[PDB]
Structures are given as C-alpha cells and as structure tokens.
C-alpha cells in the first residue's frame, strides 16, 4: 500500500524529511560496514563486542551430521508416549514399568531438568546425564543404553 506510506505526506515539503543542512547525499559514511577500526568504532564496540579477531580452532571438513545429538529434558518425558500409558502405569498393581524409547521419538540424550512423577519407568536412550540418571533411580526406574 503506497497510499499508507510516508512519501504521500511528504509532498510539498522541500527537503522530503531529510533536512536542509545535512542533505540526503549518496554515502556520507561509506558503503556497508566501513570503518570498523575507524570512524564507526564506537558503534562496533557499544553494540557488537567481539566482532574483530580470531579465536578457537579451525575445523576444515566439518559435517553437521556427526554432531547431531538432540536432547530432551525430564519435563516432556511422559509426553513421548501417549497419555493412556501414564494412567495404566499408576493403575497397575504388579509394578510393570512402561518403556519409553527416547531414540524412537527422535532424541538421543536425556537431561535431568524436570521433576518425574512417582511411578517406575524404563528409559531407553543413546546417552544420559548424571543428574538424569539419579532422578530416574530416585523414582525406582532403570536407564537402558541403546545404539
């Protein structure tokens, strides 16, 4: 909508919203990110700290497929299986703990961020955290490694 833009209200105004002393010239400060070690030093330090310099090790042929290790917290652990299995787990008097295969839903590591409900589980995952294991053992569950 060009009718809703600013240029429709600027008709009849000489400087077109750009001033009379500092005319809207072509490139007063330089094109692009010019002047990092120069006249644009303060903006590059007060808003982008760490822009200039090298740090860390180079890695020539990096494949993002190798580093794929998605994580899941203990908050949304019971959301992986359906709600029907959660009701029957506490309802069952034999103590048959349902199995939640973390790799099946698309995660590899389990992190112990959240609280677990007091009913046993069997957790199959590719990796585990230290705190995630003690929370599972605290309820009376088992951590099963799988590859």
């Amino acid at each position: 909508p060009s009718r809703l833009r600013k240029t429709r209200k600027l008709r009849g105004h000489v400087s077109h919203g750009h001033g009379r002393i500092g005319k809207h010239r072509k490139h007063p400060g330089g094109r692009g990110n010019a002047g990092g070690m120069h006249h644009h030093r303060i903006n590059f330090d007060k808003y982008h700290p760490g822009y200039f310099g090298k740090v860390g090790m180079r890695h020539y042929h990096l494949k993002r497929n190798q580093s794929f290790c998605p994580t899941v917290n203990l908050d949304k652990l019971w959301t992986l299986v359906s709600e029907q299995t959660r009701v029957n787990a506490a309802k069952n008097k034999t103590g048959a703990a349902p199995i939640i295969d973390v790799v099946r839903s698309g995660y590899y590591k389990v992190l112990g961020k959240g609280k677990l409900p007091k009913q046993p589980v069997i957790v199959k995952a590719k990796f585990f955290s230290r705190r995630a294991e003690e929370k599972i053992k605290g309820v009376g569950g088992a951590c099963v490694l799988v590859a």
Partner: protein, 187 residues
C-alpha cells in the same frame, strides 16, 4: 502569554483496541457500560486490558494458572485471564477450575474439562459476576518474550549482560576482542 509546556499535555494511552474484529468490540461495548455504571475497579482492569495489544495481554500457561491456584484466594473462586489460556505439557495433575479467557487452546479445553473444570467467556463472566466478585485476575509473563533479552543496557559494557544481535552463534561470532581478556579487553 502562558509559561506552560505542551510537551506532554497529551497522555498517550489506548481508548479503543486497534483490532477491527467485531467480537472483541461487542465485548468492549459490554465492559464500557460496566466500568462507568458499576463501582468496581475490576471492570475499569478488564476494560483497560481489552484495549491492549497482543504483546501486552503474553499468553498465560496452564501450569502457571495451576501454580497461582495452589496459592489462590482461598479456594470456589474463578480465574480471569485477558490473554489466551496456553496448555502446559510438563504438568501431570490438573484440578477442576473455573477459567475465564478470551481464547483457550484446543488441548487446554480438553484437559480442563477432563478434570471436571468449567470454561467461561467474558460475556458469561458478566452474567455470573457483574462486579468481578470472587474473581482472581491473572496475567502471563510480560517480560517472557525473547525480545526483552536484547533490551536494557547495551552489550560491550561492564556488567551489562544483554543478548547481542547475531545471525548465528559460533566460535567466530562475537567471541573476539570485545569479549576476550587475552585479546584487547573484556567487560
């Protein structure tokens, strides 16, 4: 000649919502009558919040509403939320509740009614409690947006922890001179 400043003689606030939808406007029309005819300030907070923008009336998660009803106005007491009532997946047990909201997510309607709860709209709230009697008014985390992490004191400044504007985070993306004590300086 009068030596007064017209710089801030015009208060900036919302008189009517910028939304053009007609269902909110009919609810706004209902609560304009309740504000100027009843003596309760509840009809003054609801009417003020009905004008507010989407970022001003943040969604309220279900687990927060359980948490604030674990410390309620001493138990039958309804919940009034101007925003949207969203569902939380890291909550196990939900009690029966009386919830008033402009919008409720579809999973949250099934979860509340499965526990024997009740969901009311704002026109039903006026028929139930015209003055807001026996009501708890709640709101979501206003600073819960990711936008506020970029706000405040600018980065590259001592004790000014604020997320910078970076296209992608990595080892060579604003970890150099402005951050390293080995390279130049740090704050």
């Amino acid at each position: 000649g009068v030596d007064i400043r017209h710089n801030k003689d015009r208060k900036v606030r919302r008189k009517e919502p910028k939304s053009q939808d007609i269902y909110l406007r009919l609810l706004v029309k209902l609560y304009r009558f309740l504000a100027r005819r009843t003596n309760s300030t509840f009809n003054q907070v609801v009417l003020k919040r009905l004008f507010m923008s989407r970022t001003n009336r943040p969604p309220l998660s279900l687990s927060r509403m359980i948490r604030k009803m674990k410390l309620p106005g001493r138990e039958n007491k309804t919940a009034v939320v101007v925003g949207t009532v969203t569902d939380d997946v890291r909550v196990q047990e939900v009690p029966k509740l009386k919830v008033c909201a402009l919008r409720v997510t579809s999973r949250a309607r099934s979860r509340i009614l499965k526990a024997g709860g009740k969901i009311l709209t704002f026109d039903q709230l006026a028929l139930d409690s015209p003055k807001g009697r026996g009501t708890v008014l709640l709101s979501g985390p206003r600073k819960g947006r990711e936008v506020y992490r970029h706000f405040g004191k600018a980065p590259g400044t001592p004790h000014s922890h604020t997320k910078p504007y970076v296209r992608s985070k990595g080892r060579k993306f604003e970890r150099a001179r402005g951050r390293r004590a080995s390279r130049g300086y740090k704050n």
